[PDB]
Paper text:
The recently discovered CDGSH iron-sulfur domains (CISDs) are characterized by one or two highly conserved 17-residue CDGSH motifs with a consensus sequence of [ΦCXCXX(S/T)XXXPΦCDG(S/T/A)H], where Φ and X are a hydrophobic or any residue, respectively. The [2Fe-2S] cluster is coordinated with three cysteine residues and one histidine residue in the CDGSH motif. We synthesized genes for a type 3 CISD (PcCISD) from Pyrobaculum calidifontis, which is a hyperthermophilic archaeon, a type 4 CISD (RsCISD) from Ralstonia solanacearum, which is a soil-born plant pathogenic bacterium, and a type 6 CISD (MmCISD) from Magnetospirillum magneticum, which is an aquatic alphabacterium that utilizes iron reduction to derive energy. The four CISD structures display striking similarity in their overall appearance, with dual iron-sulfur binding modules and a β-sandwich dimerization module.
The MmCISD structure was determined by single-wavelength anomalous dispersion (SAD) using the anomalous signal from the bound iron. The MmCISD structure is monomeric, with each of its two CDGSH motifs binding a [2Fe-2S] cluster. The pear-shaped structure consists of two iron-sulfur binding modules at the base and a compact β-sandwich on the top. The structure is composed of mainly loop regions (L1 though L5) interspersed by four short β-strands (β1 though β4) with a topology of L1-β1-L2-β2-L3-β3-L4-β4-L5. One [2Fe-2S] cluster is coordinated by Cys25, Cys27, Cys36 and His40 in the N-terminal CDGSH motif in loop L3, whereas the other [2Fe-2S] cluster is coordinated by Cys61, Cys63, Cys72 and His76 in the C-terminal CDGSH motif in loop L5, as predicted. The monomeric structure of MmCISD displays an internal pseudo 2-fold symmetry and bears remarkable similarity to other homodimeric CISD structures. The N-terminal half (L1-β1-L2-β2-L3) is related to the C-terminal half (β3-L4-β4-L5) by a pseudo dyad axis passing through the center of the structure. The two iron-sulfur binding modules pack back-to-back with a polar interface. The completely buried Lys64 plays a key role in bridging the two iron-sulfur binding modules. The side chain amino group of Lys64 forms three hydrogen bonds simultaneously with the backbone carbonyl oxygen of Cys61 and Cys25 and the side chain carbonyl oxygen of Gln33.
Author numbering: -7 to 79
The structure:
């Protein structure tokens, strides 16, 4: 939401204004927390229940480091696209 006045209970919250780097395995599906509520960031732990928000599945083609979005405002979820810098 562009509006800055209020947090609505269905809005994502920032976990941190910085990515969560994670070494990922090729072909394994990761479930990114889109809501900011998970206690196991950057991954969903079911805490989204009650907000209407939902995790995003991410299956990398190859092994490497994925910089998952921590601020929850990336325009290219689930990965950091730098939006945290201006959020
Ligand atoms: S805990 Fe945040 S999307 Fe599931
Ligand atoms: S942590 Fe969200 S865009 Fe970088």
């Amino acid at each position: 939401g562009s509006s800055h006045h209020h947090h609505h209970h269905t809005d994502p919250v920032i976990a941190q204004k910085a990515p969560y780097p994670v070494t990922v395995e090729a072909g394994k599906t990761y479930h990114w927390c889109a809501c900011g509520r998970s206690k196991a960031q950057p991954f969903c732990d079911g805490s989204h229940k009650g907000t209407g928000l939902a995790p995003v599945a991410y299956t990398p083609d190859k092994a490497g480091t994925a910089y998952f979005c921590g601020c929850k405002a990336s325009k290219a979820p689930p990965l950091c696209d730098g939006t945290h810098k201006t959020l």
